[PDB]
Every structure is written in C-alpha cells, then in structure tokens.
Amino acid sequence: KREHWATRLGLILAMAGNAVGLGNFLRFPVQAAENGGGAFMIPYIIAFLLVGIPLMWIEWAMGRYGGAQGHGTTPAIFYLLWRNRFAKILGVFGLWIPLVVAIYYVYIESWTLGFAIKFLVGLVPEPTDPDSILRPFKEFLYSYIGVPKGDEPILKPSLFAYIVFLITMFINVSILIRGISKGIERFAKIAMPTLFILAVFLVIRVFLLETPNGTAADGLNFLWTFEKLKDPGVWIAAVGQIFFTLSLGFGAIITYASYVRKDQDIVLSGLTAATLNEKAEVILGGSISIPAAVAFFGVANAVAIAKAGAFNLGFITLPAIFSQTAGGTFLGFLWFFLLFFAGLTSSIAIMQPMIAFLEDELKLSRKHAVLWTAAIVFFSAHLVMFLNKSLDEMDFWAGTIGVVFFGLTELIIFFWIFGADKAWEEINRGGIIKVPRIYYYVMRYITPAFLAVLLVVWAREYIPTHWTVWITRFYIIGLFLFLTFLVFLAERRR
Ligand SMILES: CCCCCCCCO[C@@H]1O[C@H](CO)[C@@H](O)[C@H](O)[C@H]1O
Ligand SMILES: CCCCCCCCO[C@@H]1O[C@H](CO)[C@@H](O)[C@H](O)[C@H]1O
Ligand SMILES: CCCCCCCCO[C@@H]1O[C@H](CO)[C@@H](O)[C@H](O)[C@H]1O
Ligand SMILES: CCCCCCCCO[C@@H]1O[C@H](CO)[C@@H](O)[C@H](O)[C@H]1O
Which amino acid positions bind phosphocholine 1, per UniProt (predicted)? Predict the structure, then answer.
C-alpha cells in the first residue's frame, strides 16, 4: 500500500538529518554571535522546550494520521483534520513552502560540492591583516556565484558552478528515485554517522588553533556567558532559530511521518531525533566556526564578522582561516564536504512533499514523481542563478515568514479545529513513552502565543525597490497558483 521505514534507527537518523542541513552546522553560532553567548542559550533552549518540542510532535502526529489515510501532503491532511474547502487552499502552502525552498536550497548545496572539489584538487586562492586574506576568497566565491560588480541585476554563474548544479540535482534524484527505504533511509544511515565523525574531527582540530591575535578557547568562552534577556529582541531571534533547528513549518516532518506505520511510536522517536539536532547544533556546530573565527580575528571582531553573514563566515571567512593553518587545504575539503552531505539529507527531504503529492494525489509512479519534481526544481532554479535578489526574496517568503505562519496553522488545525483532546490521543498513541501532560497546556495556549508574537513583530517591521524582486514574487505566486491547479486536478479525480 504505502512505503514504510524499515528501521526505527534509520527513521530517527533520516528525521534528524533533514534539519542538519538547514544551516545549523554554521547557523547557530551566527545567530548566537549576534546575540552573544550565554545570552542566546537561555531563550533558545527555552524556545526549544516551549515551541520546537511541542510543534515537532504536532507535525509527527499529523503526518502519521495522514499516512494511515494514505496522504503524506498538507492539502489532503488539512481536509481530514478540517472538512472545509478553505483548508485545501491553505494546504497548498505546505506544498508551496518546501518547493520554493528547494528551488534555492539545492543551488546553495551545489556551492559546497563545487568548493569541496576545488579544495580537494587544490584549485583554491592562496595568499597578517583580515582584509588582505579575505578579498581573494570573497572574489573566489563571487566569481563562482557570478555576483556582478556592485548593483547590476544579472548574475554570470560559472560554467563549473552550472555543471555542478546538474551533478547535485542528479545525486538527489539517485537517492529519491529509490524511495524511502532503499533511498533516504539507506543514505541517512550512511550520512549521519559520516557527519558525526567529520564534525567531531573538525571540532578537535579547530580546538587546537592558536594565533597571536587570539585563541580558539576564547571563542568557546564567548558562546557560554541579561540585560539582553530583558531586551525583547533576543526572544525573537531564538524562536525563529528553533524552526531551522528542527525543520518546523517546512512540512518535511509531516511527509516523513506519513511513512510511519499506524501504531508505531512518535513520542520517543521524535524527541530522540529532536535531541540529535540539539546535540549536533549546540556542540558540533558551536565549536567549529566561531572558535576558529575568534582564534584568528580576536573575540571582538568575530561578533562583528558574524553580523556580516553566514555565507561570509561559512564560504569566505572560514576557508580563509584554513588556508593559513597547517593542512590546511584539507580542512576546507572537510568543512564543505560536511556541508554538502548535510545538504543532501535536507535537499532530499525538502523535495519529498512534492514527490509524495504526485504519488498520493495524482497517482504518478515514483519514478515519474521524482523526475517531474526534479524538473520543476531544476527549471525554476535558473531564476535564482541569474537574478541578483531572487535567492533573498524566496528565502524571505518561503524560508522565513512562511515557515512560521505555517507552523501556526498546524497548531490551530490540529489542536483547535480538530479538537485538542482528540489530538492528544493521536500524539501519544502507541508511544513507548508518552508526553508530559504539562505540554497539553503549552501546545494549546503557550506555543500558539509565541508563534503569534513572532508574526506581528515582523509585520510591524515589514508592513511598510529593485525591479528584479517583482519577477521573483510574480514567479512564486504562479507556483502557488500552479500547485492549486494540481490540488484541483487531483480533487476532481475522485
Ligand atoms: C548547505 C547550505 C549552507 C547553509 C547556509 C544557510 C544558513 C542560513 O544563513 C542565514 O540565512 C538567513 C536567512 O533567513 C540570513 O538572514 C542570514 O544572513 C544567514 O546567516
Ligand atoms: C541541460 C539543461 C539546460 C541547458 C541549457 C542551459 C543554458 C545555460 O547554460 C549556461 O552555459 C554557459 C557556458 O559558458 C555558462 O556561462 C552559464 O553560466 C550557463 O548558465
Ligand atoms: C552530525 C551530528 C549528528 C550525528 C548523528 C549520529 C547518529 C548516531 O549514529 C548511530 O548511533 C547508534 C548508537 O547510538 C548506532 O547504533 C548506529 O549504528 C549509528 O548509525
Ligand atoms: C520530464 C520528466 C518525464 C519523465 C520521464 C519519463 C520517461 C518515459 O517513462 C517511461 O514510462 C513507462 C511506464 O512506466 C516505463 O515503462 C518506461 O521505462 C519509461 O521509459
């Protein structure tokens, strides 16, 4: 009937693996560094317990419920929880958001593969002061991406970058066309321990760094210790970070859970996978980028450096640091290959909702479903590769506002429209362990308030222009119109 996860471990590794690629290998330190160290940890762990842990369980319960019904996509599951025609249109978001993200994320996943190859081969620029070293790497990334000089709205991507984009798309297709058990699960069971050893090695190797300008021990000292706690800005930063910590709102959790059998546990399994992301992110992610950045530029600059961006830190600053340390070019290969494997576990997960839609609703073969999903993602990506602000616009609508708005939609449908006490049964059913019943009050009231707070602060910021962003808006609007036509074509089949 429906493909199911062969192993309980592989299910956890695959579920843990999708949030691994969502930046947090380098993303947590930047968001920390902006908020400082032990400042960030208190709202962030609190947000992890208050928002991520409940909302994750909400996503698991919705997906498995749909799997028994035979649907792993949001438009159908929303209709099962809420028998209303507006629910299917809202469901298109949970199909729209991962698709738009996939369009721009797989291309970023190519950059790690292309760099790793160039670092492996040694085709890397090699040069006291920060500006002397960072410029040859800024140009190296910019030549690769094809970023134009200054303002110009057209990118000239490298042929090498384009050839790698074909290879990158192909590798996903290879993993996806095999299915859940022989594709994602086999790869997750391979990729996740590969990431552990790579991170642990890098963490140990980063730990030994020391320069006349600073010491990597001070970078760790930075990460662990008001009045930032009193400043409302930090609570905003941590909650949005939890979404990427656990891949909430992207709809990836809902789809993977649909392949869980009707009576298998989600409580212990989801908590475990949620814990794996935390340990990887707090320990392995925190002890690489910032401690290395602090060791070379001093404690003060890395904070200012991290404010510039994660790409500057991840794709320019960190590779420049490795070039100066002893061996050296090899570390750059590891760091980017580490990012590439993490991207694979996520890119295969972020394209799964679209694939499951074609199989479940349009009754396409998985071979056809994967290839038509790959074609949509590959074709649309040309918009991201050649338009200057296109990547940023999609990431703002799908990756930022959308994931928060969609998570808030999940709670209201599953815990309010569906019936909270009805839903509490679905979370804990077949659970090896079962949720503490304090969360019933948190899932019902405390968690939705926080998601509501997050949306209004951004609306306060963004309720009040380059032309190229309108093309990107116009395009993703059509995608939503297109996916609505597919929900319409599928609802008229029966
Ligand atoms: C393989 C992919 C590498 C992971 C890099 C993604 C880390 C995300 O990076 C962050 O994305 C935010 C957008 O919401 C930006 O506002 C931030 O400047 C940036 O730090
Ligand atoms: C097989 C997928 C469609 C192929 C047609 C895409 C045409 C764009 O391919 C272009 O080739 C140029 C060669 O120098 C590169 O400079 C460009 O960056 C690249 O986008
Ligand atoms: C990169 C940070 C995430 C690392 C995920 C590593 C997942 C651990 O890996 C798993 O651990 C189990 C024991 O706990 C073993 O039984 C499994 O063989 C192994 O796959
Ligand atoms: C642009 C994406 C289109 C997908 C490529 C489909 C190629 C033709 O698909 C065909 O469908 C048949 C029915 O299962 C199979 O028996 C054939 O092996 C296959 O070649």
Answer: 85
